[PDB]
């Protein structure tokens, strides 16, 4: 793959390149180092100690964070039959009976959260092995298919985040936008950190954070010293 291009080098030479700062300081830097592309979304790339090769820690799943993530909380449901029969009252956002994720190579990205069902997943989504070159197609790897579609949709609309570890222990997660209040951002950050403490490493050394890297859709990123239990965000 292509690596660290001229555009990223030069943007980084204007404000800042490869260092850790306090959460208030980092985010301020990131916000103004943004270029455009499109109005600034923040995501966080969390390096922790993994026992994930042997699934002895839960760091591939998805949990609701107290504020609704991304810029629009965008939900699509691949489902069929007697599972979304019982989502009649609640309502799935979008039903794909087979075909609903296919917009990507036409220059079109679109979901915060893809909900999938047990009848659907065997058809569509069951090869989770490769999705390349991005991980958006619905997969076994973040897991937990629907017992009924109803509850799954309610959770996603409320503010559910799909996170995996990469390969070697970096857990990439959408926190929100930069327009969100320091206090509204703080909460999601704190929430992802307790989510990991619950799910501890069992013998990857006791580390729930190591190196925090932080990013937005276009600019250049920076790293945090600590983002969760320190004070404020802005």
């Amino acid at each position: 793959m292509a690596k660290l291009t001229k555009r990223m080098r030069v943007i980084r030479e204007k404000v800042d390149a490869t260092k850790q700062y306090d959460i208030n300081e980092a985010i301020a830097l990131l916000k103004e180092l943004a270029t455009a592309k499109f109005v600034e979304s923040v995501d966080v790339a969390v390096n922790l100690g993994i026992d994930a090769r042997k699934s002895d820690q839960n760091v591939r799943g998805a949990t609701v964070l107290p504020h609704g993530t991304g810029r629009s909380v965008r939900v699509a449901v691949f489902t069929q039959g007697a599972n979304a029969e019982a989502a009649k009252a609640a309502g799935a956002e979008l039903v794909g009976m087979e075909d609903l994720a296919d917009q990507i190579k036409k220059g079109e990205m679109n979901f915060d959260v893809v909900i999938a069902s047990p009848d659907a997943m065997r058809v569509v989504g069951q090869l989770g092995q490769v999705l390349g070159p991005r991980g958006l197609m619905p997969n076994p790897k973040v897991g937990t298919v629907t017992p009924n579609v109803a509850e799954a949709v309610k959770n996603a609309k409320a503010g559910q985040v799909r996170y995996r570890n990469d390969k070697n222990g970096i857990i990439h997660t959408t926190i929100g936008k930069v327009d969100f209040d320091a206090d509204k951002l703080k909460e999601n950050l704190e929430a992802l950190l307790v989510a990991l403490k619950k799910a501890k490493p069992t013998q990857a050394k006791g580390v729930y954070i190591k190196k925090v890297s932080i990013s937005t859709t276009m600019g250049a990123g920076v790293a945090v010293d600590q983002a969760g239990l320190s004070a404020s965000v802005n």
Binding site: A52, R53, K54, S55, N58, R60, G61, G81, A82, N83, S117, P118, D119, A120, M121, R122, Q126, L127, G128, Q129, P140, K141, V142, G143, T144, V145, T146, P147, N148, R164
Partner: protein, 554 residues
């Protein structure tokens, strides 16, 4: 940590033979590419059977790193006779496929009116942790296409019809999807064709976390090949590098050592000889005579197996036309093996047979031996021609039988071809002294199980040899022995090889299995075929195709 594997004072005592491994203390680190070398009986396959954990009846501590997955590839794989797809799916993705099938049942259950949603959602969590922990799976087209790119026989083919390299290449490709991090493997160079050896070289060379094998090829030792673990008195001596001049140095290190030990012993005997005349006896008569002789003066054992060598029975007298094939055609399903093949073999002729594993070489042998028939064309043998066949498949009745008994069949006197001789003396001409004869087939090295195999099938008389992969199981001193024996045999033989010198010995003619139904016959030494090949190459140079790039470089 640096220790990917570590060994503390490891040994093995075999009181019939000698001590076969002793005081092995080594540390294996990331990035290292190690070939373990030595003769038959040097303990090199055993050292790898210890590190793989196969053999654990040892002194000392043989200990792996706690987070590595460790891959081991033996010389005769555990793949059952079952089909190619079924054995390829079996020990690799099964654990993930069972998790993906339970995960589909859980999908089906979400649409069932009586399923427990809370226990379904916990089973889904423990399934997705398995499928992610394993990571890979059977997949839509991957492994299946990868096996076809790496040119393995049919996905619906039987593992039991598959020859040395193919069956090993499947086993390896599988093994690698199962456990990657450290490789421990049992002479992987023998019985694997040109494109498969160039593949194995590339893979081992790029490898992570490390590689530990064995080889008998000078090309391996130059390309992969970072470190050399010499085994020979049962001690291990790691040496960093190198090239074929080290082998020459080793031969010179043993000739110096054997002669310096033989002089020290002789030097001691002159001093011992006078002693009677009128010493007091004192420390020499006890320390010299009782303690030094038999045990301490007995180091010369490994160097002595070099001059036991090996034997092939010569022919029954036989005429000028041995074998006549005209326009022979043979296929297996849809795969053309042989098409319009014609050759006649003259007396004193040694025919080399080349090409890939599974090209159809053994199926010719089977038509000559009448366990097959020509689909089209004809095979005519002379009338007095007697055949002696040597397979890839070298299996036998039991593993707890003696060397002598497996070869003799319970006879003191054997009729070897047209002539009677004592069996014990016949079994010894394959390098077997009375204590090596009394050992069992399960105990023996592959290289001893190789001489054992040849010693057995050669009793019917050496009139017409059909040898498939001779080099297979052999250690290098047994390889020198087969070569020396073959330099003294008269010929009437059709023989396979993959090994350049061995090819150079076995041609006075060539059958080159090139492609489906293309098998070429040429009459001459391998050097003659080589000059012909360089002439074809010449003309190939000017022609624009990216075929010729492989004959130029890798």
């Amino acid at each position: 940590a640096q220790f990917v594997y570590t060994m503390h004072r490891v040994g093995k005592v075999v009181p019939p033979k000698r001590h076969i491994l002793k005081n092995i203390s080594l540390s294996f680190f990331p990035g290292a590419k190690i070939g373990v070398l030595g003769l038959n009986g040097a303990g090199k396959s055993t050292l790898l059977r210890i590190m793989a954990g196969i053999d654990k009846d040892i002194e000392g501590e043989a200990r792996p790193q706690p987070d590595i997955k460790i891959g081991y590839l033996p010389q005769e794989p555990q793949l059952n006779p079952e089909h190619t797809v079924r054995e390829s799916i079996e020990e690799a993705v099964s654990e993930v496929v069972n998790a993906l099938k339970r995960l589909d049942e859980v999908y089906a259950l979400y649409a069932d009116p009586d399923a427990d949603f809370d226990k379904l959602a916990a089973e889904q969590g423990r399934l997705e942790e398995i499928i992610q922990a394993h990571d890979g799976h059977n997949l839509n087209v991957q492994l299946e296409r990868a096996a076809d790119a790496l040119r393995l026989p049919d996905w619906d083919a039987k593992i039991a019809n598959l020859s040395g390299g193919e069956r090993r290449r499947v086993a390896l490709c599988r093994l690698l999807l199962e456990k990657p991090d450290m490789l421990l493997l049992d002479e992987p160079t023998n019985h694997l064709d040109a494109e498969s050896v160039a593949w194995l070289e590339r893979f081992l060379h790029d490898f992570e976390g490390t590689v530990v094998a064995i080889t008998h090829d000078r090309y391996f030792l130059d390309n992969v090949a970072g470190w050399i673990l010499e085994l020979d008195r049962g001690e291990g001596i790691p040496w960093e590098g190198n090239y074929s001049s080290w082998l020459e140095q080793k031969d010179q290190r043993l000739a110096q050592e054997a002669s310096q030990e033989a002089a020290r012993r002789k030097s001691i005997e002159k001093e011992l000889e006078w002693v009677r005349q009128g010493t007091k006896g004192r420390q020499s008569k006890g320390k010299a005579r009782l303690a030094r002789f038999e045990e301490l003066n007995s180091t010369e054992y490994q160097k002595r197996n070099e001059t036991n060598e090996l034997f092939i029975p010569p022919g029954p007298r036989l005429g000028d036309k041995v074998l006549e094939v005209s326009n022979l055609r043979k296929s297996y399903g849809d795969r053309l093996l042989i098409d319009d093949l014609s050759f006649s073999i003259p007396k004193g002729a040694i025919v080399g047979i080349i090409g890939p594993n599974g090209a159809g070489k053994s199926t010719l042998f089977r038509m000559i031996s009448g366990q097959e028939q020509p689909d089209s064309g004809t095979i005519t043998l002379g009338e007095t021609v007697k055949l002696a066949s040597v397979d890839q498949f070298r299996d036998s009745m039991d593993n707890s039988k003696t060397v002598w008994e497996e070869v003799s069949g319970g006879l003191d006197i054997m009729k070897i071809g047209n002539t009677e001789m004592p069996s014990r003396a016949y079994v010894g001409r394959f390098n077997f002294k009375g204590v090596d004869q009394g050992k069992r087939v399960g105990e023996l090295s592959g290289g001893e199980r190789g001489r054992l195999h040849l010693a057995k099938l050669l009793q019917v008389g050496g009139n017409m040899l059909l040898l498939d992969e001779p080099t297979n199981d052999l250690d290098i001193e047994t390889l020198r022995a087969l070569e020396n024996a073959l330099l003294e045999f008269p010929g009437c033989a059709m023989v396979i090889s993959h090994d350049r010198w061995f090819l150079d010995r076995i041609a006075t003619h060539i059958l080159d299995y090139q492609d489906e139904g293309k098998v070429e016959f040429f009459e001459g030494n391998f050097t003659e075929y080589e000059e012909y090949k360089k002439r074809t190459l010449g003309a190939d140079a000017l022609e624009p195709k990216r075929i010729k790039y492989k004959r130029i470089a890798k």
